[PDB]
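Final report, results section. Input specification for complex C-07:
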Amino acid sequence: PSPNLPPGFDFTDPAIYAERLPVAEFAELRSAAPIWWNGQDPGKGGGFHDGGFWAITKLNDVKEISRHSDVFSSYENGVIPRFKNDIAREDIEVQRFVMLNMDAPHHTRLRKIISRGFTPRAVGRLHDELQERAQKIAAEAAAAGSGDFVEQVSCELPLQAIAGLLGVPQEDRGKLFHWSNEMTGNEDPEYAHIDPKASSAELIGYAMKMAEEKAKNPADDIVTQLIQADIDGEKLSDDEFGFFVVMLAVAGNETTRNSITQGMMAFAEHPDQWELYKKVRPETAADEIVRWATPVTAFQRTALRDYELSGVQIKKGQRVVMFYRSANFDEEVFQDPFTFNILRNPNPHVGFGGTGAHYCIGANLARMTINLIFNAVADHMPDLKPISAPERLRSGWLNGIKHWQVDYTGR
Ligand code: HEM
Ligand SMILES: COC(=O)c1cccc(-c2ccncc2)c1
Ligand SMILES: COC(=O)c1cccc(-c2ccncc2)c1
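Structure output:
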């Protein structure tokens, strides 16, 4: 029996996500068609013109695709499953210059070098300064009495995480943050005038300038470890470091921001959990926040050969779209998936992707950013209560909140 969905329903349809998360639709697929052909009419495939894709809705299937990188390619069509319908193919393939959209062995070499910048020591060295700024962010917001939680609480700390990871001087962080903000949301009317391409170019130019300067003055930021050759001569060229900085500016910003915003939306909806958090400050909360937020609704892969997955024949060349939003609520993996439980432990969510070659390198940095900001929110604005409904972001694969008016004082 076919799944009870509207005819022509596209799970990457930005017009859906601008209003709601299609939670019931995902649940219907999990029950009636866990791997389902998502057809797309001509010119309505968000940049891809192959007629549709396989909607992947079960956690285990998401994990199987993520593990079998040899079959399910990121490079072939990139991992973002939706752009503007009119995007030029070359503007998709230019994104192959970032680690996210590479296959082995190119990806293998790159992740090995980049790993130097995300060692636990490198991230943990940001703990104290981010905790400081986190406390300052919440106190300044709380003093304002009320405002947009997205902008006064959620936005800054992720941007400062990136800046501190790269050693960007404070005088440059403004433009870094603007470049980062200019690379997501171009399908939402509020961001119709942003130019992700131009900001990428400028960012590359800034990053390459930074690489040659950090070569003359070996600091202790990751930049020196990345452009310094190891015993086998492996390092990032100046342009390779340019693309890595582009990768960081886009990845390190809005996903964590929307985790924070939707973490708090969850807390306002689940007072018992908010109360529990304020007393125990459990760090397991960060993972339940990411599972609940699933800031990346979906990433895609392209099959390099015929492959049978859970009884369905994936054909060579076809796209499979991993709906993390569905997998993170898989009744077969989670006890009470639709209960918000900040003590959930273990929490094998795929908010950071399925385990495999492309698993989020910023996972523990994002977790630390979330734990720090929610401790600060708990310290400074514990009686926060919302004022109006969040404004959702029009995107086909990102789960975003543009705005959320909250009373920080509590009334
Ligand atoms: C809550 C915040 C975040 C979420 C939800 C998230 C989500 C994801 C997901 C789902 C993947 C898997 C990609 C795939 O398998 O195709 C991924 C990979 C990646 N993440 Fe994140 N991420 C977050 C934070 C960050 C941060 C803070 C950084 C950098 C500071 C970062 C950098 C990356 C990179 C570079 C990759 C690609 C790694 C590779 O291809 O080897 N992410 N992320
Ligand atoms: C928003 O897309 C990107 O994140 C991206 C990724 C890789 C490369 C480029 C790029 C390279 C050269 N010129 C313009 C853009 C952009
Ligand atoms: C080419 O990449 C992107 O345009 C992009 C845009 C938004 C978010 C992310 C992201 C965030 C966290 N982890 C991995 C990727 C990437």
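The chain has one domain: 14-407. The pocket of methyl 3-pyridin-4-ylbenzoate (ligand 2) is lined by residues 94-95, 97-98, 183, 196-197, 200-201, 243, 246, 250 (CB under 6 Å). This concludes the modelling results for the funded period.
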